[PDB]
Design a protein around this ligand. Structure first.
Ligand SMILES: Nc1ncnc2c1ncn2[C@@H]1O[C@H](COP(=O)(O)O)[C@@H](O)[C@H]1O[C@@H]1O[C@H](COP(=O)(O)O)[C@@H](O)[C@H]1O
Lengths: 522, 423, 616
């Protein structure tokens, strides 16, 4: 990385009218003592005032029963947790009812607050963005000198949801409130550290924690700095009229070094002091990634073309199975595993799995563009791959299964890449239902065979001479739904020719169920 | 009838008249195998070696020479008969007319005084001629039986003082070995092949207790017997192959000391075994082993950590172990290792860091392997002569190309061809 | 000297241009001046609010899209996006080029006499000169670059005119070298149109009155001037910060989230800009570096400087006579071609931070050039070309010797050759999609889409390999999953190749591909109105010769009464397709071809009068 961008990001943010408009709204809300809503030049500002006395420091879990729910956040363990007082205040002030009426018909909304009002504003924005259906308007959140809201699990959940770039926390380097919380509290979002000389943006939770530590150990405590944000905003917003040069010694010859030195100077620290070096290391550590994602994403097409022949081999194996005289369909051929071509197609399957696991890991680590999954090419390539390959993974699981202590594929044994690809499929415009004149070249439901395995187990258990008649009724209420779903799939021509092969497991199960119904008098 | 014979068989006999006795016998032996099926080279080679007392290279020469005369067809392969490669995964084919000529030649005269006892085709039970004349011993040195399922009452007694090789072909799920084996005083090689779609179970396996004089054994598509501590050791076995075999828990017994049974085994092959998950740790106790082949075993994930005991080991083939993830660090202590084959090992990523201790290494094959780097130690391998790798991995071998002179680094061309589907 | 060696103009021409610009104040809407071997057209400037913002335009910056028929080159070829310009300036030009004025006849007379033509102007006269130069290029220079000679455009303190696509298109056609723009360091008019209309609505008229060189009776109230300057510079800072952050790919996700909420000016510099001070003349070619410099050369360095700059910015719009008279004494530097730029930018009043951002702007162009060199190195390799050679020389003749053709073979066969062809199809798709991915992100130079070698290679690839992708689409029944190929299945790389080739072939004669296709359809005499035909031939495969098989797949199996018109259109285009080599005539009439097998089942009445009755 030859280019530092921490100062440029802060300059971009400070030069916009949202900066000043949101501060104006916050100041008015503080003066009034109540929530203020109004439009300025086509953007609605929701300012929330600062409540003088509330007890902070007690964390509690997010609601899961009440009327306020965050279905978009992770519910696994360890659990995300928030401050109890903020939730209590949000419930008390009945912000939900006010916003559900005042924001109707709006297009752009900025929620903002100062101090405890800032914490409440961030909580409100997170609630608005955490629903199952994305809001009909756009949302941004700006806070000024706000204390921390949650713990590490909440921060990680927000980051994994791709929501951390809707927040911007403006913090003065002499303000103690944002860095005076107990160690269980973690930051999230983008932080803008500002002084009398400029600002710097840090986006990494670890870097923000390190900066908090540095400021705690290398600063003097002035308790009246919580009332200087208007002065800071005025100074920063008017800085554009004068030219600002390096005031230290001589700038380093390297461009990256010069940028780092300028950023260190933007916060008031001399580059030859003891705290200047710590700040320099913090910034350099924050700004560390390699191999520009645009170029990486362009390159990936060659790697896909490298791995494509394995998919072609799976296609050829499917075609050869379709014409065989045994007439099992390629799922049962692979499951039997009694020929030499099965081992080779296994090779191809493993290669494909490795490639797509690497791609998903790269997406999750920000080595690719933030909008990589919205590309048509990659969506359709992943769809093609899954349609061909998932049945063979199901056959592998049910081949290598310990019959006694072996669970089921869909009951917690599905690979992660297939779930991520199913999620990606929700992009791209929906297709109009064409008229099908033939069976699909592949079964469009990629988990059909796992469901058939579960239905087969249910039918055998009901058939067993020890089957309990109550067990039998429950099992029939489990068995007839699958029969109806499979019949609908067959009549719509959504399955391939292999599902209809003479000696495939589906035909055998169908004949067995017909026999069972005939015997049982149903 | 007469015309077909006089017009084809006589011509082929005239052509065969130029063959010397060893090559003529190798030609005739080919009539013991079913029709239109491939014959792996290892079976034929071991038969010839134990019959005419040759070496492997000489018998390979015999087979190739037979091919040159248009009496035999080789099957195409990218590494057919290259240096240090195996013989159980390459094949030959014979045209129907040639097999008919061989069968007629071997089946001439009285049954008892024949050299070779062969069954031309699959039948339910043994031919009636053999039982009609069982009152007298047979002087044959080759017996080949091709039947279906057999039961203990389907067999009748037969005396074979001179038999040296026995070949059995069947296609079923249960089979009982003939009881006359225990009176085969000169049996040196045994071949048992199942053609069925599921593994077969062999009964009355105790005959192997008295097979003190066996030197080779070939098993295919069968349930490997559950070896126990009370088994009678095979004191003369030198070769052992298991092709498409089911192991179950036969080798998983903890109280099993495999080294006791095979005091002089030098060659071991395990191929196309899907339920093999690990090797028994006692295999390292066989000190006479010279070469090991564990190929097309997709679920094996690691090798035993006592490999440093196998001091006589020279060849180590592991290709197509799709899940093997590393090589044990003990490989660097082997003082005679010469050849390593790890091609099609798509889960293997790096080599042992001390691989530069094996100074006897001469050849390495890494075709379609997933290697991300090679250690800086390989610069110390002075004896290296041939390396095979992918076209994308040539940049990793520049250091060795510089250090070790006389080293040839070959990039293998990706192969099309639709023959793998013809199962 | 270096100035003439760089720009292609000399001091005498610049002096004459300034003189003609001065004379243009009196004449109505333009002035013509004849001098030996040179003819100069100078355009009158205007100083009203409605001459910068059109009162009937409802947008926030007064922009409008150009007409694709009048300016067919001002667009992005592969993407197909047209450029936008200022509406008031365009209306002024449209008024001037109206036949009732005699401007066009004068231009034609000047062309006939083989003189050197020059367009020039001061203030908005300069913007009119820029648009007139573009009009002349489109109407004369691209038709016959021998009969019609090169133009020159000279402006003095003009405002910005077009957006970034405008500049990109000028760069791709190699026309940027004709334009030269003179700017004084503190002049404000070049910066005005980077501001929102609502920011300067209240104060714009009074400042425009002050700027008029003829009006001298208006008060110069310092308050209004300072307010105007401050608001313009605030909007400029916003624009410059966002632009530099965008070009380096720094904060994509945050920038997108924030972009939803902002309104930023779309205007960008076009051509070569020459900055002048009392000691130096600096020339720059890079548009983004010029934007950064326009922001950073106007900042104050003390509290004493800040008390004189708002008035200086107005006083410096009337200082080009002195610049022309003193040109010969000053120093000359070319910024793009200098190893060290620190001293030059020091003398221009740029601080350390602005110097960082100008450096970044230049480095991005260097990166684009390196990317292009890497791409060329890749596509010149013999191993790459052997795949196309194999498809050309082995697969096609063999499938012809089978009497079914390589389209049908790829569609239905399982042999080794088909597997090899599939592998090579995927391998080539990888390379071309990598190039497309780099292009869509502006990581390549502006001139890549006009390079003849690239066009030839891409045309060869498309004509050879697109039929196999159509066969692949239909073999796997993908047309019953997401619809016809021509609507949603066609890859973008083939569309880019087709558009590049069409532009290259057709631009010399003025007309665009769509009108050519519609005229050719009208010429078939199907007996229908234009609207009915346009509705019947929507998303049809008869626009491109490499989509012949997609069209055949779509029309196959339907009754004739329903597809009469499409069958007739396809048969009409087939002969010209065969002549140009877009379709191979050794492939499609074979005995086992899909096209022949379908065509021989049509009614005999149609087959009697078909143009291709003797081929089959
Ligand atoms: N329905 C469908 N299934 C799979 N792939 C599809 C489908 N429609 C289109 N595509 C392919 O998606 C990419 C999109 O690229 P751009 O974003 O437009 O640059 C393109 O390759 C489309 O191609 C056509 O689809 C086939 C895909 O085959 P492949 O997976 O073997 O590459 C191509 O043969 C082509 O006809």
């Amino acid at each position: 990385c030859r280019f530092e961008t921490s100062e440029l990001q802060a300059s971009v943010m400070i030069s916009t009218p949202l900066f000043t408009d949101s501060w104006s709204s916050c100041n008015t809300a503080n003066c009034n003592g109540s929530i203020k809503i109004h439009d300025i030049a086509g953007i609605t500002y929701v300012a929330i005032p600062a409540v003088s006395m509330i007890q902070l420091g007690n964390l509690v879990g997010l609601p899961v029963t009440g009327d306020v729910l965050f279905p978009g956040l992770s519910s696994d363990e360890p659990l995300p947790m928030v401050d109890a007082a903020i939730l209590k205040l949000f419930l008390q002030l009945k912000i939900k009812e006010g916003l559900e009426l005042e924001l109707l018909g709006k297009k752009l909304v900025v929620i903002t607050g100062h101090s405890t009002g800032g914490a409440l504003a961030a909580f409100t924005a997170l609630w608005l963005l955490s629903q199952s259906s994305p809001p009909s308007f756009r949302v941004f959140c700006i806070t000024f000198g706000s204390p921390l809201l949650g713990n590490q699990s909440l921060s990680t959940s927000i980051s994994r949801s791709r929501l951390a770039h809707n927040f911007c926390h403006v913090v003065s380097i002499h303000d103690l409130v944002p860095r005076s919380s107990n160690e269980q509290f973690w930051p999230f979002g983008t932080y803008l550290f500002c002084s009398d000389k400029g600002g710097v943006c840090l986006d990494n939770a670890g870097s923000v924690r390190l900066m908090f530590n540095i400021l705690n150990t290398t600063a003097t405590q002035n308790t009246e700095e919580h009332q200087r944000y208007g002065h800071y905003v005025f100074t920063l917003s008017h800085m554009f009229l004068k030219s600002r040069s390096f005031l230290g010694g001589s700038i380093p010859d390297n461009s990256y070094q010069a940028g780092v030195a300028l950023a260190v100077e933007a916060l008031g620290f001399s580059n030859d002091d003891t705290s200047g070096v710590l700040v320099k290391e913090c910034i350099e550590t924050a700004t560390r990634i390699v191999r520009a994602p645009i170029l990486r994403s362009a390159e990936l097409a060659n790697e896909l073309a490298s791995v494509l022949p394995a998919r072609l081999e799976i296609q050829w194996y499917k075609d050869r199975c379709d014409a065989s005289e045994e007439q099992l369909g390629y799922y049962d051929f692979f499951k039997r595993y009694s020929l030499k071509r099965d081992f080779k197609v296994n090779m191809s399957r493993i290669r494909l799995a490795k490639f797509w696991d690497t791609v998903i890991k790269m997406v999750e680590t920000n080595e690719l563009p933030f909008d990589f999954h919205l590309g048509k090419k990659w969506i359709y390539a992943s769809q093609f791959y899954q349609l061909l390959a998932e049945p063979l993974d199901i056959a592998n699981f049910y081949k290598n299964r310990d019959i006694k202590t072996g669970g089921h594929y869909l009951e917690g044994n599905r690979p992660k890449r297939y779930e991520v690809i199913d999620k990606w499929q929700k992009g791209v415009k929906v297709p109009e239902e064409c008229v099908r004149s033939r069976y699909a070249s592949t079964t469009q439901d990629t988990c059909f065979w796992a469901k058939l395995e579960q239905a087969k187990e249910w039918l055998d258990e009901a058939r067993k001479e020890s089957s309990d008649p109550q067990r039998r009724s429950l099992l029939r209420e489990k068995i007839v739904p699958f029969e109806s779903y499979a019949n609908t799939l067959v009549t719509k021509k959504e399955v391939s020719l292999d599902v209809k092969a003479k000696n495939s497991s589906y035909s055998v199960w169908e004949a067995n169920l017909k026999e069972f119904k005939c015997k049982m008098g149903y | 009838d007469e015309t077909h014979e006089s017009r084809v068989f006589a011509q082929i006999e005239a052509t065969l008249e130029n063959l010397d006795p060893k090559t003529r016998d190798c030609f005739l032996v080919l009539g013991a195998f079913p029709e239109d099926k491939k014959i792996p080279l290892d079976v034929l080679i071991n038969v010839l070696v134990e019959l005419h007392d040759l070496e492997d290279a000489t018998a390979f020469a015999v087979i190739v020479d037979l091919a040159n005369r248009n009496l035999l067809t080789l099957v195409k392969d990218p590494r057919f008969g290259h240096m240090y490669t195996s013989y159980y995964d390459i094949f030959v084919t014979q045209h129907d007319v040639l097999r008919d000529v061989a069968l007629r030649l071997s089946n001439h005269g009285k049954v008892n005084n024949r050299e070779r006892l062969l069954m031309p085709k699959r039948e339910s039970m043994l031919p009636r001629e053999w039982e009609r004349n069982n009152d007298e011993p047979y002087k044959a040195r080759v017996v080949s039986i091709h039947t279906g399922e057999m039961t203990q009452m389907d067999w009748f007694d037969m005396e074979l003082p001179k038999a040296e090789v026995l070949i059995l072909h069947f296609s079923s799920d249960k089979y009982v070995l003939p009881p006359f084996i225990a009176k085969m005083g000169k049996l040196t090689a045994l071949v048992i092949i199942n053609n069925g779609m599921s593994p077969a179970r062999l009964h009355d396996f105790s005959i192997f207790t008295n097979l003190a004089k066996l030197k080779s054994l070939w098993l295919q598509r069968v349930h490997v017997p559950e070896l126990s501590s009370s088994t009678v050791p095979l004191q003369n076995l030198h070769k052992l192959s298991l092709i498409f075999c089911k192991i179950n828990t036969s080798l998983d017994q903890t109280e099993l000391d495999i080294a006791q049974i095979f005091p002089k085994l030098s060659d071991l092959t395990i191929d196309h075994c899907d339920d093999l998950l690990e090797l028994p740790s006692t295999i390292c106790g066989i000190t006479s082993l010279n070469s090991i082949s564990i190929t097309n075993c997709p679920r094996i994930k690691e090798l035993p950590k006592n490999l440093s005991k196998l001091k006589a080991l020279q060849l180590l083939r592991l290709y197509a172990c799709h899940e093997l993830n590393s090589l044990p660090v003990e490989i660097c202590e082997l003082p005679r290792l010469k050849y390593v084959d790890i091609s099609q090992c798509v889960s293997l990523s790096s080599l042992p860091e001390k691989i530069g201790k094996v100074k006897t290494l001469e050849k390495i094959d890494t075709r379609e392997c997933s290697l991300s780097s090679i250690p800086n130690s390989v610069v110390l391998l002075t004896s290296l002569r041939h390396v095979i790798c992918d076209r994308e991995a040539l940049w990793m071998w520049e250091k060795v190309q510089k250090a070790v002179a006389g080293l040839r680094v070959e990039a293998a061309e990706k192969s099309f061809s639709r023959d793998w589907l013809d199962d | 000297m270096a100035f003439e060696a760089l720009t292609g103009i000399n001091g005498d021409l610049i002096t004459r241009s300034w003189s003609a610009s001065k004379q243009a104040y009196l004449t109505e809407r333009y002035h013509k001046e004849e001098a030996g071997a040179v003819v100069i057209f100078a355009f009158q400037p205007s100083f009203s609010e409605k001459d910068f913002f059109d009162p009937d335009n409802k947008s926030s910056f007064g922009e409008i899209k150009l007409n694709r028929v009048q300016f067919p080159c001002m667009r992005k070829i592969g993407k197909g996006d047209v450029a936008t310009v200022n509406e008031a300036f365009l209306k002024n030009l449209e008024a001037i080029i109206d036949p009732r004025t005699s401007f066009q006849a004068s231009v034609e007379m000047a062309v006939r006499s083989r003189k050197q033509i020059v367009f020039t102007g001061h203030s908005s006269g300069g913007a009119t000169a820029i648009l007139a130069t573009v009009w002349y290029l489109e109407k004369y220079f691209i038709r016959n670059p021998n009969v019609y000679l090169e133009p020159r455009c000279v402006t003095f303190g003009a405002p910005l005119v077009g957006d970034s696509i405008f500049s990109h298109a000028l760069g791709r056609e190699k026309w940027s070298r004709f334009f030269v723009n003179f700017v004084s360091r503190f002049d404000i008019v070049p910066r005005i149109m980077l501001a929102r209309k609502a920011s300067v609505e209240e104060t714009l008229p009074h400042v425009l009155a002050q700027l008029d060189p003829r009006k001298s009776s208006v008060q110069e109230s310092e308050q209004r001037i300072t307010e105007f300057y401050t608001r313009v510079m605030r909007d400029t800072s916003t624009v410059a910060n966002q632009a530099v952050c965008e070009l380096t790919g720094s904060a994509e996700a945050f920038l997108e989230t924030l972009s939803s909420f902002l309104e930023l000016s779309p205007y960008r510099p076009a051509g070569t800009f020459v900055f002048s001070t009392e000691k130096r003349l600096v020339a720059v070619n890079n548009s983004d570096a010029i934007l950064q410099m326009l922001f950073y050369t106007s900042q104050a360095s003390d509290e004493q400087e800040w008390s004189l700059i708002p008035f200086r910015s107005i006083r410096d719009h009337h200082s080009y006579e002195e610049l022309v008279q003193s040109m010969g004494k000053k120093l000359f530097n070319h910024l793009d071609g200098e190893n060290s730029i620190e001293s030059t930018l020091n003398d221009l009043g740029v601080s350390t931070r602005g110097r960082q951002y100008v450096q970044a702007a230049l480095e991005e162009e260097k990166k684009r050039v390196e990317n292009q060199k890497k791409i060329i190195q890749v596509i010149e390799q013999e191993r790459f070309l052997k795949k196309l050679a194999w498809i050309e020389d082995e697969y096609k003749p063999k499938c012809q010797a089978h009497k079914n053709g390589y389209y049908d073979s790829f569609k239905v066969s399982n042999e080794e050759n088909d597997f090899k062809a599939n592998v090579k199809r995927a391998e080539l798709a990888g390379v071309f999609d990598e190039v497309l991915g780099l292009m869509k992100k502006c990581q390549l130079p502006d001139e890549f889409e006009g390079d003849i070698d690239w066009i030839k290679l891409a045309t060869r690839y498309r004509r050879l390999v697109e039929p196999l992708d159509i066969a692949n689409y239909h073999r796997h029944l993908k047309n019953e999953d997401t619809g016809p190929y021509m609507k949603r299945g066609r890859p973008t790389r083939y569309i880019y190749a087709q558009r590049g080739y069409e532009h290259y072939i057709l631009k010399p004669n003025g007309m665009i591909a769509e009108d050519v296709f519609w005229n050719k359809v009208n010429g078939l005499n199907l007996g229908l109105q234009l609207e009915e035909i346009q509705e019947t031939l929507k998303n049809s495969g008869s626009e491109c010769g490499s989509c012949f098989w997609a069209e055949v797949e779509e029309l196959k199996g339907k009754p004739y009464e329903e597809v009469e018109v499409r069958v007739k259109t396809l048969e009409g285009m087939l002969g010209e397709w065969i002549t140009d080599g877009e379709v191979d005539d050794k492939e499609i009439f074979l005995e086992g071809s899909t096209f022949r097998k379908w065509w021989i089942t049509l009614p005999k009445n149609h087959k009697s009068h078909s143009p291709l009755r003797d081929y089959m």
